[PDB]
Design an enzyme around this catalytic site. Structure first.
Site, PDB file in Angstrom:
ATOM      1  N   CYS A 176       0.742  -1.252  -0.023  1.00 30.83           N
ATOM      2  CA  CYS A 176       0.036   0.040   0.206  1.00 30.83           C
ATOM      3  C   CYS A 176       0.759   1.116   0.041  1.00 30.83           C
ATOM      4  O   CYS A 176       0.563   2.469  -0.401  1.00 30.83           O
ATOM      5  CB  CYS A 176      -0.858  -0.091   1.279  1.00 30.83           C
ATOM      6  SG  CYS A 176      -1.771  -1.461   1.338  1.00 30.83           S
TER       7      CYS A 176
ATOM      8  N   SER B 115       8.805   2.886   5.653  1.00 28.59           N
ATOM      9  CA  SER B 115       7.588   3.493   5.330  1.00 28.59           C
ATOM     10  C   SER B 115       7.091   4.653   6.016  1.00 28.59           C
ATOM     11  O   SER B 115       7.866   5.628   6.377  1.00 28.59           O
ATOM     12  CB  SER B 115       6.644   2.503   5.526  1.00 28.59           C
ATOM     13  OG  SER B 115       7.350   1.027   4.980  1.00 28.59           O
TER      14      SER B 115
ATOM     15  N   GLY C 198       6.216  -2.211  11.367  1.00 30.34           N
ATOM     16  CA  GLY C 198       6.443  -3.644  11.256  1.00 30.34           C
ATOM     17  C   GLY C 198       7.631  -4.176  10.297  1.00 30.34           C
ATOM     18  O   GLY C 198       8.553  -4.807  10.605  1.00 30.34           O
ATOM     19  N   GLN C 199       7.351  -3.889   8.980  1.00 33.35           N
ATOM     20  CA  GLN C 199       5.936  -3.739   8.351  1.00 33.35           C
ATOM     21  C   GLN C 199       5.601  -4.577   7.493  1.00 33.35           C
ATOM     22  O   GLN C 199       4.882  -5.502   7.370  1.00 33.35           O
ATOM     23  CB  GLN C 199       5.842  -2.413   7.844  1.00 33.35           C
ATOM     24  CG  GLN C 199       6.435  -1.237   8.574  1.00 33.35           C
ATOM     25  CD  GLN C 199       6.331   0.041   7.926  1.00 33.35           C
ATOM     26  OE1 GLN C 199       7.405   0.686   7.762  1.00 33.35           O
ATOM     27  NE2 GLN C 199       5.146   0.426   7.256  1.00 33.35           N
TER      28      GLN C 199
ATOM     29  N   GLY D 158     -15.092  -5.183   4.379  1.00 33.46           N
ATOM     30  CA  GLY D 158     -13.979  -6.099   4.157  1.00 33.46           C
ATOM     31  C   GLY D 158     -13.290  -6.620   5.424  1.00 33.46           C
ATOM     32  O   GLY D 158     -12.387  -5.911   5.933  1.00 33.46           O
ATOM     33  N   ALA D 159     -13.840  -7.622   5.718  1.00 33.00           N
ATOM     34  CA  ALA D 159     -13.413  -8.386   7.190  1.00 33.00           C
ATOM     35  C   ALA D 159     -12.236  -9.017   7.146  1.00 33.00           C
ATOM     36  O   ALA D 159     -12.178  -9.881   7.894  1.00 33.00           O
ATOM     37  CB  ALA D 159     -14.652  -8.995   7.332  1.00 33.00           C
TER      38      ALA D 159
ATOM     39  N   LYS E  49      -7.782  -9.521   7.015  1.00 30.92           N
ATOM     40  CA  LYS E  49      -6.808  -8.962   8.071  1.00 30.92           C
ATOM     41  C   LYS E  49      -6.923  -7.686   8.666  1.00 30.92           C
ATOM     42  O   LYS E  49      -6.944  -7.523   9.880  1.00 30.92           O
ATOM     43  CB  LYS E  49      -5.326  -9.315   7.512  1.00 30.92           C
TER      44      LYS E  49
ATOM     45  N   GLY F 133      -9.196  -5.297   8.064  1.00 31.64           N
ATOM     46  CA  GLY F 133     -10.647  -4.803   8.621  1.00 31.64           C
ATOM     47  C   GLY F 133     -10.935  -5.321  10.020  1.00 31.64           C
ATOM     48  O   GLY F 133     -11.714  -4.812  10.968  1.00 31.64           O
TER      49      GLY F 133
HETATM   50  N1  LIG Z   1      -2.573  -6.268   4.556  1.00 31.72           N
HETATM   51  C1  LIG Z   1      -1.732  -5.253   4.875  1.00 31.72           C
HETATM   52  O1  LIG Z   1      -0.569  -5.426   5.326  1.00 31.72           O
HETATM   53  C2  LIG Z   1      -2.323  -3.930   4.054  1.00 31.72           C
HETATM   54  C3  LIG Z   1      -2.008  -2.719   4.961  1.00 31.72           C
HETATM   55  C4  LIG Z   1      -2.648  -1.574   4.750  1.00 31.72           C
HETATM   56  C5  LIG Z   1      -3.863  -1.747   3.698  1.00 31.72           C
HETATM   57  N2  LIG Z   1      -3.885  -2.809   2.835  1.00 31.72           N
HETATM   58  C6  LIG Z   1      -4.751  -2.782   1.796  1.00 31.72           C
HETATM   59  O2  LIG Z   1      -6.150  -2.961   2.180  1.00 31.72           O
HETATM   60  C7  LIG Z   1      -7.023  -3.898   1.306  1.00 31.72           C
HETATM   61  C8  LIG Z   1      -7.074  -5.310   2.302  1.00 31.72           C
HETATM   62  O3  LIG Z   1      -6.102  -6.003   2.467  1.00 31.72           O
HETATM   63  P1  LIG Z   1      -6.202  -7.315   3.424  1.00 31.72           P
HETATM   64  O4  LIG Z   1      -4.598  -7.665   3.978  1.00 31.72           O
HETATM   65  O5  LIG Z   1      -7.120  -6.928   4.400  1.00 31.72           O
HETATM   66  O6  LIG Z   1      -6.660  -8.595   2.472  1.00 31.72           O
HETATM   67  P2  LIG Z   1      -7.441  -9.906   2.681  1.00 31.72           P
HETATM   68  O7  LIG Z   1      -7.374 -10.377   4.347  1.00 31.72           O
HETATM   69  O8  LIG Z   1      -6.962 -11.062   1.673  1.00 31.72           O
HETATM   70  O9  LIG Z   1      -8.921  -9.802   2.471  1.00 31.72           O
HETATM   71  C9  LIG Z   1      -9.371  -8.658   1.691  1.00 31.72           C
HETATM   72  C10 LIG Z   1     -10.788  -8.464   1.853  1.00 31.72           C
HETATM   73  O10 LIG Z   1     -11.521  -8.111   0.775  1.00 31.72           O
HETATM   74  C11 LIG Z   1     -12.956  -8.901   0.273  1.00 31.72           C
HETATM   75  N3  LIG Z   1     -12.299  -8.795  -1.111  1.00 31.72           N
HETATM   76  C12 LIG Z   1     -11.578  -9.403  -1.839  1.00 31.72           C
HETATM   77  N4  LIG Z   1     -11.776  -9.207  -3.321  1.00 31.72           N
HETATM   78  C13 LIG Z   1     -12.983  -8.339  -3.045  1.00 31.72           C
HETATM   79  C14 LIG Z   1     -13.907  -7.986  -4.293  1.00 31.72           C
HETATM   80  N5  LIG Z   1     -13.371  -7.926  -5.331  1.00 31.72           N
HETATM   81  N6  LIG Z   1     -14.948  -7.011  -3.956  1.00 31.72           N
HETATM   82  C15 LIG Z   1     -15.395  -6.961  -2.741  1.00 31.72           C
HETATM   83  N7  LIG Z   1     -14.748  -7.527  -1.520  1.00 31.72           N
HETATM   84  C16 LIG Z   1     -13.540  -8.235  -2.006  1.00 31.72           C
HETATM   85  C17 LIG Z   1     -12.480 -10.078   0.993  1.00 31.72           C
HETATM   86  O11 LIG Z   1     -13.782 -10.764   1.092  1.00 31.72           O
HETATM   87  P3  LIG Z   1     -13.592 -12.474   1.417  1.00 31.72           P
HETATM   88  O12 LIG Z   1     -13.321 -12.737   2.770  1.00 31.72           O
HETATM   89  O13 LIG Z   1     -15.185 -12.883   1.270  1.00 31.72           O
HETATM   90  O14 LIG Z   1     -12.788 -13.218   0.354  1.00 31.72           O
HETATM   91  C18 LIG Z   1     -11.781 -10.024   2.188  1.00 31.72           C
HETATM   92  O15 LIG Z   1     -12.559  -9.656   3.252  1.00 31.72           O
HETATM   93  C19 LIG Z   1      -6.218  -4.260   0.255  1.00 31.72           C
HETATM   94  O16 LIG Z   1      -6.369  -3.132  -0.653  1.00 31.72           O
HETATM   95  C20 LIG Z   1      -4.719  -3.767   0.689  1.00 31.72           C
HETATM   96  O17 LIG Z   1      -3.824  -3.620  -0.309  1.00 31.72           O
HETATM   97  C21 LIG Z   1      -3.075  -3.833   3.223  1.00 31.72           C
END
Ligand SMILES: NC(=O)c1ccc[n+]([C@@H]2O[C@H](COP(=O)([O-])OP(=O)(O)OC[C@H]3O[C@@H](n4cnc5c(N)ncnc54)[C@H](OP(=O)(O)O)[C@@H]3O)[C@@H](O)[C@H]2O)c1
Ligand SMILES: NC(=O)c1ccc[n+]([C@@H]2O[C@H](COP(=O)([O-])OP(=O)(O)OC[C@H]3O[C@@H](n4cnc5c(N)ncnc54)[C@H](OP(=O)(O)O)[C@@H]3O)[C@@H](O)[C@H]2O)c1
EC number: 1.2.1.70
Lengths: 411, 415
Positions: free
Chosen positions: A51, A110, A116-117, A187-188, A190, A192
């Site tokens: 991100c 960052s 962490g990160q 978006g539930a 990691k 959320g």
């Molecule tokens: N992870 C990090 O370290 C980091 C840090 C800050 C921000 N972010 C950003 O925040 C966002 C989420 O990351 P995450 O790590 O939480 O991902 P994640 O754990 O893989 O889950 C993503 C969530 O989005 C849902 N989703 C996936 N595709 C979708 C779609 N096309 N339409 C609607 N919902 C969808 C999934 O639903 P299901 O559970 O039903 O599959 C899941 O709940 C990303 O854009 C990421 O780049 C990431």
């Protein structure tokens, strides 16, 4: 000779609206890597897409030509002109590059100076890459050694994951902008889940959670008894945002979930909280269109806007980020030694073949004048009795000088 | 192991002290073997001239070798260790090589009044040939000095010690007059004194030599001057007929003491009734007690030192280029000398290979006309496998020094 190069856009320079165009879904990393290795001066590649940054790590034959090719490739896949990218392009070579990827993985580049990160993301890159041919010895090694560094620094500095700090920052900002506000998380995953934990620790007792599948939310609800979690399926999204004062969007969607049209039609937020609906969008690519900011009674924030928070016990200004840099300085020079100990492979093979061309010529020379097995064995015995020694000598600094010696003494 | 120069020179020690350290050419072999017989001295050379006495050694330990050499100097000269310590000149490694290069060039900062010692360096190497202790490091040093001396001569034209001493002798003798000339000893130095007497206009000289052959030779090669031979036993009479007496024999004991010359009739009133003994011999041919005679003046090589230095500076040309030659060759020598630490691994390698080769060859020859072929295979494979590591252990000097030496340690590790 060949260089490891890093070629990137980060939050330190490029804006999220520019950076998100080079975002590469995990499912397309193998494709990306293959494309990069199709370029004429690129032998290995990896993409680190997070991100805060989009970073391409390559093993280039030529520094200048590698950079021209990867940059042209960035332009092609993103849609962004080469001229713009160059203006925001980040470039380091060899030792500086490994230095960089160590600081990133440790959390020393960052946004907060104590984080962490990208340790989880560097592990994900190694995972995804295991099948990928283009993810070769050099770049995989770099990343693996980045995992090692990430973990060491983590136990010393004790600096929370990047996922922890972005979610933390989302809650602080919302609470900053607010003068009981109704909380809603879309978006539930990691992130959320992390947003929800941070809301609880802030004292929040009710949140509406919109997600693609209910199962994840079921887990979270079961896991966090203290708070009232209300699940809503994704097609009920717009109802949720309208019964909410702040909307957290944290989904892996590659296209915005909210445009100007969607939110202008939403009933206004309660005057008790100022009549504004705060969209706190920590997704990259963003789940909220920037057009939504044209809606008078709405506020939009993205990951870049978590910069006006960055307040969490600033005393780790040295401690964490100081104790870590010593780790980084020792692991680097350790890694460089390791990288140098790779050219030892072409040497073991070659030196064997070098003696094999002499063995053969002399054998042949002799045979023109089972005694034949005797002299064949004699020719093998003399050679093995000269290879056997150098076979293990190929500490690590003495093994290295052994290798350089054979190369000078032979080819 | 270090190269050490341990010296006394006219910088600090008078001739009365230096001469006790003097070592005749016929005794270099004995001295070097005595020296190399010391516990920490692996190689030695003796540089004996009229201005200096220097021992050059290869020592296991700097302080121990020096203490041992110092003791030997005391033991062979009669001079107590504490007097020697007072005058002792000491330099190690690169400072010593720089020093011998300068001395050989006639550019010794501390002995400005000497002239090139190149001829004497060439002699040390020549005699050193058959001398066990005159090893590769020290002969090498001296041979490099020879090269430096020649180059520097071609660039600056600094005269020999020999030429500049005899020339100073005549000059001083002429400065001390406002004359019947006598020269005792007709070898290198005496011939030179005569030549400089002619150079100055002298048309008659009585030459006292032990053997006549030399004086006959001189007489014939220089027809323009009246040369009057006179046997050694008559030298006292010759003295009584001269106004200046040049002594230049290799006698290690004095020829004139005070009893001999207080006896003689006074030199011509036309030169101020003073008889001048110009003694250029080391050890001295004229007793110092001779100076107690009121109508007499004595001079030795110490007294020439200023007039040698003045003339050397007057005729000085291209000093900087000379010092360049010395600085560069110094580092070229250290390069060659660093190169030498490669010899033990070369032999060990070669013994290693030969032991493998014969071992494997006898295996094959206990399983079998065509014995020289099978032999050839074995040496052929070894030599061809070894040739690379054999041309990457021998270098001149440049870069490849550090690499060459790193091949050594690597070859040490792998075998
Ligand atoms: N992870 C990090 O370290 C980091 C840090 C800050 C921000 N972010 C950003 O925040 C966002 C989420 O990351 P995450 O790590 O939480 O991902 P994640 O754990 O893989 O889950 C993503 C969530 O989005 C849902 N989703 C996936 N595709 C979708 C779609 N096309 N339409 C609607 N919902 C969808 C999934 O639903 P299901 O559970 O039903 O599959 C899941 O709940 C990303 O854009 C990421 O780049 C990431
Ligand atoms: N050579 C130099 O660069 C240098 C410089 C300045 C001074 N000196 C000194 O000057 C002296 C002569 O040196 P050099 O190189 O000219 O010598 P040289 O060429 O070897 O000849 C020496 C001369 O001394 C005679 N001689 C030897 N032993 C004698 C003895 N026991 N009694 C009487 N005469 C004896 C020899 O007589 P025969 O002809 O019968 O053999 C010969 O004429 C030495 O003391 C030397 O230290 C040398």
């Amino acid at each position: 000779r060949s260089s490891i190069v890093v070629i990137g856009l980060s939050i330190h320079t490029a804006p999220v609206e520019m950076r998100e165009k080079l975002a590469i879904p995990e499912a397309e990393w193998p494709r990306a890597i293959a494309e990069l290795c199709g370029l004429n001066h690129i032998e290995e590649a990896a993409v680190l897409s997070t991100c805060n940054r989009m970073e391409i790590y390559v093993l280039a034959l030529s520094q200048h030509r590698g950079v021209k090719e990867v940059t042209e490739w960035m332009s092609k896949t993103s849609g962004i002109p080469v001229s713009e990218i160059c203006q925001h392009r980040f470039l380091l070579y060899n030792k500086d590059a490994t230095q960089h990827i160590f600081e990133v993985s440790a959390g020393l580049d960052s946004l907060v100076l104590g984080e962490g990160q990208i340790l989880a993301q560097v592990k994900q890159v190694v995972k995804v890459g295991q099948g990928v041919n283009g993810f070769g010895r050099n770049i995989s090694g770099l990343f693996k050694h980045a995992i090692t560094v990430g973990k060491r620094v983590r136990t010393e500095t004790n600096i929370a994951s990047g996922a922890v700090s972005v979610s933390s920052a989302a809650v602080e900002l919302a609470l900053m902008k607010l003068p009981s506000a109704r909380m809603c998380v879309i978006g539930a995953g990691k992130m959320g889940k992390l947003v929800i934990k941070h809301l609880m620790a802030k004292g929040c007792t009710k949140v509406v959670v919109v997600n693609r599948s209910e199962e994840r939310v079921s887990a979270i609800r079961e896991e966090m008894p203290g708070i009232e979690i209300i699940y809503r399926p994704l097609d009920e999204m717009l109802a949720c945002a309208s019964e909410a004062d702040v909307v957290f969007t944290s989904t892996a969607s590659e296209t915005p979930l909210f445009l100007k049209e969607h939110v202008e039609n939403l009933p206004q937020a309660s005057p008790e909280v100022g009549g504004l609906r705060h969209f706190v969008d920590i997704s990259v690519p963003r789940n909220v269109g920037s057009c939504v900011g044209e809606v008078e009674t709405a506020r939009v924030y993205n990951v870049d806007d978590l910069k006006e928070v960055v307040a969490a016990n600033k005393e780790d200004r040295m401690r964490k980020a100081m104790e870590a840099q010593t780790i980084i300085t020792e692991e680097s020079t350790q890694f460089e030694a390791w990288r140098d100990s790779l050219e030892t492979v072409p040497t073991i093979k070659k030196l064997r073949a070098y003696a094999e061309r002499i063995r053969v010529a002399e054998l042949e020379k002799c045979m023109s004048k089972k005694t034949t097995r005797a002299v064949d064995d004699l020719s093998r015995g003399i050679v093995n009795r000269f290879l056997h020694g150098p076979m293990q000598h190929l500490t690590l600094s003495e093994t290295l000088e052994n290798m350089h010696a054979l190369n000078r003494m032979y080819g």
